[PDB]
């Protein structure tokens with residue numbers, strides 16, 4: 001069984017690192033902004049073996065014209081934001097949802113808060129407070145998932161690996177329903 005998974009969300013929100021930690025079980029140390037990329041992952045969930053094609057896309061606005069080339073025949077969307085960037089969450093209904101609903105009507109969307117490790121990081125908290133900001137609250141993420149009619153809401157850290165396996169378990173489960 002093969003499923004196509006596409007990942008989308010603001011530049012630097014952690015999409016590539018999430019994909020590669022799961023697929024290669026290594027955190028990529030060099031940050032290379034994505035135009036497009038592709039990885040395979042194997043997963044066994046609930047006694048079922050599935051092969052995932054992981055379609056990586058550009059977060060950057062400069063590659064908006066190329067990004068719809070990733071959308072055909074998608075089984076599940078991972079729509080990401082970063083927990084250290086309230087701006088990335090605001091972009092969910094303003095940018096990512098209208099695009100994904102346009103090109104992928106009826107494809108299940110999992111809303112994913114990335115970089116969960118930064119929520120309790122004191123250095124992050126203090127930097128954000130200088131800007132009158134704080135890490136995204138889980139509640140804000142859940143409220144957004146309900147607003148955009150997501151299939152599910154999850155948080156993870158590719159850096160620590162927390163919640164990473166669950167992201168792809170839920171994605172595979174969404175994938176298995178059409």
Ligand SMILES: Nc1nc2c(ncn2[C@@H]2O[C@H](COP(=O)(O)OP(=O)(O)OP(O)(O)=S)[C@@H](O)[C@H]2O)c(=O)[nH]1
Nearest residue numbers: 011012013014015016017033034059115157158159
């Ligand atoms: N602290 C922390 N940093 C992370 C985590 N995941 C990725 N990053 C870091 O954030 C930066 C962006 O990560 P990356 O995964 O490459 O972003 P992207 O969403 O794929 O970005 P783009 O390709 O749309 S430009 C990198 O420096 C990376 O090491 C995480 O879980 N925790």
Ligand SMILES: [Mg+2]
Nearest residue numbers: 015016033034
């Ligand atoms: Mg990337």
Ligand SMILES: [Mg+2]
Nearest residue numbers: 068102103104
């Ligand atoms: Mg069109």
Ligand SMILES: [Mg+2]
Nearest residue numbers: 138142153155
């Ligand atoms: Mg939650």
